[PDB]
Design a protein around this ligand. Structure first.
Ligand SMILES: O=S(=O)(O)O[C@@H]1[C@H](O[C@H]2O[C@@H]3CO[C@@H]([C@H]3O[C@@H]3O[C@H](CO)[C@H](OS(=O)(=O)O)[C@H](O[C@H]4O[C@@H]5CO[C@@H]([C@H]5O)[C@H]4OS(=O)(=O)O)[C@H]3O)[C@H]2OS(=O)(=O)O)[C@@H](O)[C@H](O)O[C@@H]1CO
Ligand SMILES: O=S(=O)(O)O[C@@H]1[C@H](O[C@H]2O[C@@H]3CO[C@@H]([C@H]3O)[C@H]2OS(=O)(=O)O)[C@@H](O)[C@H](O)O[C@@H]1CO
Ligand SMILES: [Ca+2]
Ligand SMILES: [Ca+2]
Ligand SMILES: [Ca+2]
Ligand SMILES: [Ca+2]
Ligand SMILES: [Ca+2]
Ligand SMILES: [Cl-]
Ligand code: NA
Ligand code: NA
Length: 457
């Protein structure tokens, strides 16, 4: 088999005529030489441009700017000079914040945001806000986002959210677009560069994340569970990389039925694996309105599905036991089923060994073959991450990890071609699947603690 080819125009079509060309500083008065907010100047620039029949271009010149909660509009095309630094404006209302929103509160068509030359910088290192995302997308079609570096500080949320939004009684999401040429430094393990929820015909290219996951196709937004609309279909990706993280590319459908995906040229250095695929599953969440405990939510679930039908709940989410019998009961009561992907193919995978990968607890038993004494693995301190057990740092485990339920009726497949490993120790794993043997060789909660230097990267 060989991969299918494509051209940029299959996804995005640039404007062939425009009405205006404005400068953020010269025409709208922003100041790139101070530490003050520039959001009003950018929002007026965007609105003035969208009011012209054929839209236009806006240049953000060299300097340092502060933005938050910007609403993008139709027919607006933003270009950013190579020495620009963009930082988030402080907002202490404790809510979830984004620098830019595209189609979340309205309809957007024909839009782009691109860095010139070798790209610019989005810097979160001086921010006190932990709940930050760079872009949140909704009802937008025919768009392009490209060329910059993100200096993260282990914030919550993935940097680019390819999400859904409600309007007129149903959900809407993005279609026809390109997201490319972005590097992220110091990401928190549970997040990373991209997270996809709802999407049709999108191309992801030249993306790299240090920590977490670069292209995380984990479709679990609760709105999609209620309306039963969303998911991703007809997705293409090329040159996706990971360093000191979980994986470069990951598939995790949760409860959603998704479509087809094609990926070429995946690489990693000191990551758990280059490619990762999780089984679909049904998880029941406890109401915030009601007070519960670990064992209290588990009991509440088994009292409806049956005994042995609920896995131990975690910070509360209870995952239904992987047994056709229980799964058939959960559908009748909650009307939910395990999700999946349609056709998925990944070509040319290269994994380079290292001692500083992000690792999950349920993966540590795979060191039994090559690292029987669990050397070089550490547990982050409570100060570093308060929920001990959710993250470990240690040697890379394999080139590919696949835990889809092969012998089950709810299985889905992710096929890999031309997989290679570099500098791995004797007896390590190439592909880990549900039949791979393992044994406990690590001290889960009593092992050595990670030094500050090792966690901070
Ligand atoms: O109270 S304790 O002392 O902590 O009790 C201990 C055990 O609790 C722990 O159990 C595991 C290890 O650390 C915490 C919990 O981790 C979470 O386990 C999930 C199991 O399904 C899942 O692991 S996974 O399956 O490998 O993915 C969680 O990760 C996922 O979470 C979301 C779903 O997919 C991803 C997320 O979107 C994935 O994470 S990732 O994207 O980074 O890959 C994992 O975090 C801990 O419980 S806690 O609620 O987190 O505090 C307990 O089970 C045991 O019985 O006792 C010990 C102490 O004796
Ligand atoms: O998409 S987000 O709103 O950014 O994240 C949500 C969820 O946060 C929201 O939850 C309710 C509805 O609007 C706000 C809150 O009242 C919003 O958070 S707020 O910005 O602090 O007000 C977040 O808690 C969860 O983790 O993710 C979902 C994903 O949509
Ligand atoms: Ca300013
Ligand atoms: Ca200039
Ligand atoms: Ca530059
Ligand atoms: Ca499978
Ligand atoms: Ca199969
Ligand atoms: Cl996220
Ligand atoms: Na930097
Ligand atoms: Na973030």
């Amino acid at each position: 088999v060989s991969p299918k080819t494509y051209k940029d125009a299959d996804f995005y079509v640039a404007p062939t005529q425009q009405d205006v060309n404005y400068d953020l500083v010269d025409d709208f008065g922003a100041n790139g030489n101070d530490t003050s907010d520039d959001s009003n100047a950018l929002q007026r620039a965007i609105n003035a441009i969208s009011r012209k029949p054929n839209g236009g271009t806006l240049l953000i010149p060299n300097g340092t700017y502060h933005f938050l909660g910007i609403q993008m509009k139709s027919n607006v095309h933003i270009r950013v000079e190579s020495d620009v630094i963009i930082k988030p404006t402080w907002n202490g209302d404790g809510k979830n914040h984004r620098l830019f929103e595209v189609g979340v509160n309205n309809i957007v068509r024909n839009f782009s945001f691109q860095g010139l030359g070798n790209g610019f910088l989005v810097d979160f290192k001086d921010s006190r806000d932990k709940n930050l995302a760079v872009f949140k997308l909704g009802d937008v079609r025919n768009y392009k986002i490209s060329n910059f570096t993100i200096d993260d500080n282990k914030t919550i949320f993935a940097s680019i959210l390819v999400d859904v939004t409600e309007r007129n009684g149903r959900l809407h999401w993005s279609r026809n677009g390109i997201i490319e040429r972005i590097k992220q430094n110091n990401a928190l393990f549970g997040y990373g560069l991209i997270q996809t929820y709802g999407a049709d015909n999108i191309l992801f290219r030249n993306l790299h994340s240090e920590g977490g996951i670069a292209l995380r196709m984990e479709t679990d937004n609760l709105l999609m569970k209620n309306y039963k609309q969303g998911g991703i279909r007809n997705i293409f990706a090329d040159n996706i990389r990971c360093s000191k993280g979980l994986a470069a590319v990951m598939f995790g459908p949760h409860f959603m039925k998704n479509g087809d995906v094609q990926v070429t040229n995946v690489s990693s250095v000191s990551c758990g694996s280059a490619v990762r695929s999780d089984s679909g599953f049904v998880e029941l969440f406890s109401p915030t309105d009601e007070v519960h405990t670990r064992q209290s939510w588990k009991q509440a679930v088994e009292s409806k599905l049956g005994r042995g039908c609920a896995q131990t709940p975690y910070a509360w989410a209870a995952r239904v036991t992987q047994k056709d019998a229980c799964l058939d009961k959960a559908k009748l009561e909650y009307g939910i089923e395990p999700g999946s992907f349609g056709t998925v193919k990944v070509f040319d995978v290269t994994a380079r060994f290292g001692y500083n990968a992000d690792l999950k607890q349920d993966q540590l038993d795979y060191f039994s073959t090559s690292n029987p004494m669990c050397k070089r693995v550490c547990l982050p301190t409570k100060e570093q991450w308060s929920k001990q057990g959710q993250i470990y740092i240690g040697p890379s485990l394999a080139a590919v990890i696949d835990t889809t339920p092969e012998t089950s009726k709810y299985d889905y497949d992710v096929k890999t071609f031309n997989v290679k490993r570099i500098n791995f120790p004797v007896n390590s794993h190439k592909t880990i699947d549900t039949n791979t043997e393992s044994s406990r060789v690590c001290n889960y909660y009593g092992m050595s603690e990670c030094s500050s230097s090792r966690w901070e990267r």
